[PDB]
Design a protein around this ligand. Structure first.
Ligand code: HEM
Ligand SMILES: [F-]
Length: 146
């Protein structure tokens, strides 16, 4: 987990992002797909489609909301090693099953701090907090076997 300090920093930068869950959520997905085109292929719903097709998809919202909803929960429990344990476990378990491995999470981690700053300048130490958080997730994935 994250320390109570680091978790607070993450939550602080996330608030402005989550404030507009629908819009920001859809934008995070689009930003990912734009920077890491291979990622789209993992989604049954978006395999083959272009970012334009995806933006116009009536399914986008369902996908980006389920991601932001889950993410919020991760931010909310980040400083609790206990909740993180089960959360990471279940998350990893679900994703590996769909063919997603840590490499796809290394990508998310890469672009995430940039995505948040596009909504509002994070406090100092917030970016390190996120990379740590995503580091926890990448580890879980490798343990799950991907
Ligand atoms: C940034 C963090 C992400 C969060 C918190 C997250 C969250 C989730 C959740 C909560 C589910 C199950 C939702 C449901 O249908 O009830 C799921 C499904 C899945 N996610 Fe992720 N996700 C993350 C990133 C990604 C990435 C990077 C990929 C592909 C690279 C992806 C691929 C999948 C796939 C393929 C499914 C299976 C259902 C489907 O095909 O839509 N996820 N995700
Ligand atoms: F997802």
């Amino acid at each position: 987990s994250l320390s109570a300090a680091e978790a607070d920093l993450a939550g602080k930068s996330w608030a402005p992002v989550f404030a507009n869950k629908n819009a920001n959520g859809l934008d995070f997905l689009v930003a990912l797909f734009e920077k890491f085109p291979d990622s789209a292929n993992f989604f049954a719903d978006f395999k083959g489609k272009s970012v334009a097709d995806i933006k116009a998809s009536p399914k986008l919202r369902d996908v980006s909301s389920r991601i932001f909803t889950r993410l919020n929960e991760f931010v909310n429990n980040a400083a609790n090693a206990g909740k993180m344990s089960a959360m990471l476990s279940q998350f990893a378990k679900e994703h590996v099953g769909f063919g997603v491995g840590s490499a796809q999470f290394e990508n998310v981690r890469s672009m995430f701090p940039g995505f948040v700053a596009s909504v509002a300048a994070p406090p100092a130490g917030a970016d390190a907090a996120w990379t740590k958080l995503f580091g926890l997730i990448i580890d879980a994935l490798k343990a799950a076997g991907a």
